[PDB]
Design a protein around this ligand. Structure first.
Ligand SMILES: [Co+2]
Ligand SMILES: [Co+2]
Ligand SMILES: [Co+2]
Ligand SMILES: [Co+2]
Ligand SMILES: [Co+2]
Ligand SMILES: [Co+2]
Ligand code: NA
Ligand code: NA
Ligand code: NA
Ligand code: NA
Ligand code: NA
Ligand code: NA
Lengths: 284, 284, 280, 280
């Protein structure tokens, strides 16, 4: 992918780049197309100095990527159901995740601007799931190619589960990426639960190795745009100040990979799952 | 403790002994007192060849130890609410546990006879919690002496939790024993959940080392009597035949140890527990 | 005539009614059958078994080891003396898998020891393999592992299939063990650690093992090709065994489906889990 | 005059408006204060810093290492040349803790390298200790640990408190690190493994670390007494740094509250977690 129009400053070899010399407010078609190519190359891009970006322009920009979420309940900007308000007080959780993978159609990506927050504190990290897959040895890539996993959530107000390939192809690059994440993946469907725990434990740690991640410090006016299909992210929980972001969410992913090479694991009647590793029975 | 009356065949150095030359049916006071001393020395004792032991004698024997459970719902022998029927079909679960530690007053012990089952298969193992504590190095014994743990269960029909010392004294021997177990212990109260997971993971494995356990193969007419205050046990899940036992449960333990040396750990508002080790979100 | 008493459904059986001293070819054929069925068998009441008969018995199975340095019975280089003092190690292992030709099996008799303490456990490696789900069995069928040992006076390593096919039964068995397996050759070391850690624990589940309490005159015979065993370290009394070791195994499995993992120059192995750098 | 830009709330700050070449005693006092506050500081725009000034700067902190074998700048034995080719290792460590007197700290400038790739991370060992719950802090205060290294041309070990008191701030900091700590001396090895495994992961939580992208002319200065650091291994281009190392630390903590764990004769350490027996 050719991207030569702007001044691009990559964060790490794995992913991330800050793009200078762009004004989002009245971006042209040609400049948008270039930002989209930079997103496909760098997975998350950062656009500094966009203070004052109008609501209408933010929505138009998001709609250049696809349909925008109009969340039923999460607060939105007055007059604009597509611009979601994220407040550290109103709702943090530092855990590696890919957004909404407990649903059959997770988002394609998001546009986030932190409009209020501390000068230091509250960094966001992203990880490169292409590299997480590619860094596995050949026998393990071949195994994962034929597996699926159940992703689920069960909290007050939301119960959802979905089955996805463990390895998905990015529809627009054709490259394969890992598609499990600590927050929302439950278990691999074709393994028993204990085998699944062991393999997922390894994959979660490996996939978020420092060599596969980047860490971004938010500044006034900074916009992050990321591809949810091939990344995880993590919100660092190291601040107590009020922190507010404006977020637009682009819907419409269908994670797709190889046909599974085995049936789901079927337990016998009465079989009990005894995890090999301790988790407490009571949270906080 | 002096025990010289019968022929005693210890199973292992850690615990367990088979007692020959005893007839439970009309046991004398003096012979019972000797069996009780052998229980305090060996933690679990096995009495072979007791086929035909009458219901009235089984209940009288149990009552020599204390008050007998008359479970509200678990099935009991016709005419005898104290003799519980345990059926592999009607209700197994192979997990190390101490009985009912999710309650404030777990049982003192049990008398179990397997009246129907396979010739091989379905062994029971017991562990010595005195040795599990004593085998910890001095800095760790000193730490555990001042901790407590929450034990809990949440299944259809039963929700219960209780806080117990991590190290308890046996009231009748004065010796200290570990009092956590994989099945029912949730978390150590004075640690955060992640620290608790790490320490409990170590203790669970260490406490069930082969050097601290014994394994008993059931035969027709065999009776096992064990002290629930200072043991764990584990039912091996390696058979498919029907397996039936008659069980009498002696109530009335209060696990007691040192006063805790620290307050309970208090999380901050909104704090989320993220286990360091994967467990699946969906059981079977 | 033999009465067979299985210890567990997974493995192990005590065989009564046998006299090893002058066993006939036909009775030996039955013991052989029972060893292929039960993997380890225990023969009680053999006090006095002569040295010449013990050696002839082992030779029915194959060539006997004449260890250069282990003490042996005066006059009989094939009958090894195993003394808890002179030599224990409580660790799950399969014997000598760091060698290209491990033993087929062993015949052991604990002639001195405490009345309780010092049990030996065995595990069923057929069940350890069969209990894995289909995707994982498929993976392991195509893998090999390096087994090694590095102690004063012994350096050895060997590569073996992770899943071997027993030559007589045709049944597949796991062939890794905690004591001597180093790493799976086709994975990187960190992936290897994670998988082996799971397999070691799973393979010694109580549902796959048995535990034997030694009695005077009892002989244990086991197939080292499809078992692990573990010597429980819960005694301090003197414990002596007489052992004959049958050589000649060549673990055989599928051709690997992938090449060895090749690190890049200067690559460092950083284990994900801590081990101390200093032993005792 | 200095503008301070913290990287994270845990640690790290970039200091603009500084000229190291002829820094005054009073301005140095301010840098020293900022190092005790931020643990690692980054000074951009120092291209051309003279060798004599670089050495004088390090000498303000203490005695400089003159390594016998590491290459150094022609004419200047104190200015070490660190080349990605000639010498990386991505592993969390505190420098030379296998020695009884580790460095107080270092001054590093990456003079050649890629525009992206090769970040360095640091962690705050004060926060790693303070984030433990009270029972565990109480335990660690009374423990010590053996740190060691065994490579061709270097064997060293040292015993240090698990929790050290920084000499200037009086604040307590964890003093174990994954690369060089072997085991806690007062526990058995298996207990030690379990606790160190927890501490290593906890101590390098994202909430306790920072990540720095090197730029031409940037100098990093850090306090090795209360940090770990990690060199990210995500590049293949040539990377050269100039480093001055300040010697003279003696980690100090509470007298241990227990004796060393003493194994019995013949006791074997069997780790609960697998590590391969062969590296690369
Ligand atoms: Co609305
Ligand atoms: Co998110
Ligand atoms: Co009734
Ligand atoms: Co029970
Ligand atoms: Co052996
Ligand atoms: Co260093
Ligand atoms: Na649209
Ligand atoms: Na597991
Ligand atoms: Na699709
Ligand atoms: Na009574
Ligand atoms: Na933990
Ligand atoms: Na009491």
């Amino acid at each position: 992918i050719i991207t030569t129009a702007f001044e691009v400053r990559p964060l790490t070899s794995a992913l991330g780049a800050e793009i200078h010399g762009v004004r989002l407010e009245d971006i042209t078609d040609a400049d948008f197309a270039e930002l989209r190519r930079l997103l496909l190359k760098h997975l998350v891009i950062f656009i500094p100095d966009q203070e004052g970006w109008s609501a209408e322009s933010r929505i138009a920009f998001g709609r250049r990527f696809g349909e925008l979420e109009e969340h039923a309940y999460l607060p939105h900007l007055d007059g604009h159901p597509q611009i979601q308000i994220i407040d550290s007080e109103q709702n943090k959780i530092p855990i590696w995740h890919t957004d909404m993978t407990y649903a059959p159609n997770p988002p394609i990506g998001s546009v986030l601007q932190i409009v209020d927050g501390p000068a230091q504190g509250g960094d966001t990290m992203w990880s490169n799931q292409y590299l997480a897959y590619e860094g596995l040895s050949a026998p393990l890539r071949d195994l994962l190619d034929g597996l699926t996993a159940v992703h689920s959530i069960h909290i007050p107000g939301l119960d959802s589960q979905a089955e996805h390939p463990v390895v998905r192809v990015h529809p627009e690059t054709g490259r394969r990426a890992l598609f499990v994440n600590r927050a929302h993946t439950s278990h691999i469907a074709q393994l028993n639960r204990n085998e699944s725990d062991a393999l997922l434990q390894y994959l979660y740690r490996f996939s978020t190795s420092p060599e596969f991640t980047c860490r971004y410090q938010w500044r006034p006016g900074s916009v992050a745009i990321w591809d949810n299909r091939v990344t995880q992210h993590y919100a660092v929980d190291d601040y107590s100040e009020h922190r507010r972001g404006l977020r637009v969410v682009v819907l419409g992913d269908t994670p797709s990979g190889d046909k599974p090479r085995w049936d789901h694991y079927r337990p016998v009647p009465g079989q009990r799952y005894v995890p090999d590793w301790v988790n407490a029975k009571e949270a906080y």
